[PDB]
Amino acid sequence: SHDCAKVDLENAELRRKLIRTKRAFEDTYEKLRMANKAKAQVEKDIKNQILKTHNVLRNV
Amino acid sequence: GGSHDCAKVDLENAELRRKLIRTKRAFEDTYEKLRMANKAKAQVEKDIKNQILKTHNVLRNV
Amino acid sequence: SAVIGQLRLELQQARTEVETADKWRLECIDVCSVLTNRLEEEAGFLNSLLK
Amino acid sequence: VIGQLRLELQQARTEVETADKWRLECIDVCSVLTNRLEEEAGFLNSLLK
Ligand SMILES: [Zn+2]
């Protein structure tokens, strides 16, 4: 047997905590995905810049 | 028994605890990855600043 | 007497020396222009990374 | 009896001196700019990790 009121209260509290943690994880995961995307773009543009400079130094 | 299905709420509490441990761990791991990413990016931006200053110093002295 | 002859030769060598010095000087200026423009572009890019 | 040609021939030699002087300064400039571009490209490459 259990405490019926106690397991109802714990059910509700767990659902609340789970939703809050889900929202926190979804927000953090989206921030990290956007960060990874931005970093990937940066690395592509950096590659192009390195290529421009090595072309310049080569033509010298 | 009383106003709920006792077995059902026992199972649902146990599953909610499992899901909460998993989701907590996912959030902590992702947050740590984000914290590391932000720190590395901050360091990169400091170094970028110093590089810009070095280049403008050269160009000015030219 | 005949001093005009050799002096013309020395002046023509000097002309070739101005041609060489000015030629390599302009080539160096073109190089410096390309390198400066590239440094300005790259500094602008690095600045763009801070936004 | 002319004499004056010494200045004109020396002015031409002074012009070689000026051109060579600015050229050597330009070579120093190009060396500094080249070194800075090499350093900067190395830095940008270092960001790729
Ligand atoms: Zn019950």
Numbering used by the authors:
A (entry chain B): 1081 to 1140
B (entry chain A): 1079 to 1140
C (entry chain D): 494 to 544
D (entry chain C): 496 to 544
The authors write:
In flies, Centrosomin (Cnn) forms a phosphorylation-dependent scaffold that recruits proteins to the mitotic centrosome, but how Cnn assembles into a scaffold is unclear. We show that scaffold assembly requires conserved leucine zipper (LZ) and Cnn-motif 2 (CM2) domains that co-assemble into a 2:2 complex in vitro. Purified CM2 forms a stable 2:2 tetramer with the purified LZ of the PReM domain, and we solve the crystal structure of the LZ:CM2 complex, revealing that helical dimers of LZ and CM2 interact in an anti-parallel fashion. Thus, Cnn molecules have an intrinsic ability to form large, LZ:CM2-interaction-dependent assemblies that are critical for mitotic centrosome assembly.
Most of these substitutions strongly perturbed the ability of the LZ to form a stable 2:2 tetramer with CM2, the only exception being L535E, which still formed a 2:2 tetramer but with reduced efficiency. Perhaps surprisingly, LZ-L535E appeared to be folded normally and was largely helical within the crystal structure. Although L535 is packed within the core of the LZ:CM2 assembly, there is sufficient space in the core to accommodate the longer E535 side chain, and E535 also forms a hydrogen bond with the invariant CM2 T1133 residue in the core.
